[PDB]
Every structure is written in structure tokens, then in C-alpha cells.
Amino acid sequence: SMEQVAMELRLTELTRLLRSVLDQLQDKDPARIFAQPVSLKEVPDYLDHIKHPMDFATMRKRLEAQGYKNLHEFEEDFDLIIDNCMKYNARDTVFYRAAVRLRDQGGVVLRQARREVDSIG
């Protein structure tokens, strides 16, 4: 139907905007601490601690399959990256501290993303 096509175009355009958001958030992790899944070879107990692992590569795979239907779903995954790290790692670690800085800097980006998503529809 034509309605299905219009819905698909809206999803495509959201995907475009989320790709720009993802790039901007990933620039706030210049150490690449959050770039890839935590390795279960290197951290074999990880899944005993963290039930829903997340990372920027995993998000990018979902995004490119147009698997984010709205900005809330995308933010949920971003918050998992941060929140997982802040539980597994202690406050005195470069990992925790990177997550704090990514959360604080990403908030600014996400605030305007929400306005754009609402504004453009």
C-alpha cells in the first residue's frame, strides 16, 4: 500500500537521524571503551553480572537493519551501555569514569535529538 511505503520512508528517515546521533555519541568515547561487546573469552563471568550486554557495534547492527522504531528504543540501548558499565566496574576505574563522561556529554546530543524527532515527526 501507499500507507506502508510512507511508514517505511518515516522509518528510513528516523534511521538517518539516529545514525547521525550514534556518530555524535560515539565521538564522546574517544578511548573506544564502548565500541565493541565485552569479550566473554576475556571476562568469562560477565553474563552472571550483566543480563543485557550492549555496545556501539551492536547498536549499529540494529540501526542498519532499521531495528529502532522510535528514539526511546535507541536511548534504551545507549543507557544499557552506560548502566552496565557503572555496575560491573567500580567508581575508581577508567571504565566507570568513561561511562560518566559519555552519559554527561551524550545527554546534550539526545536532548536535541528528541526535539528533532518531535519537530520533523
CATH number, domain containing residue 38 = 1.20.920.10
Q: Cell 528504543 belongs to which residue?
A: 73
Strands of 23-76 (E only): list them: none
* Structure determined by: X-ray
Cell for 113? 535529538
* 49 touches 87 (CB < 8 A): yes
Domain that holds residue 34: 1-121
DSSP structure class, residue 30: T
- Resolution in angstroms for this experimental structure? 1.4
Cα–Cα separations (whole angstroms), residue 41 to 46, 47, 89, 96: 10, 12, 18, 21
Element (H, E) at 97: helix 94-120
Q: How many domains, the chain? A: 1
How far, in Å, CA of 69 to CA of 63, rounded? 9
How far, in Å, CA of 67 to CA of 53, rounded? 17
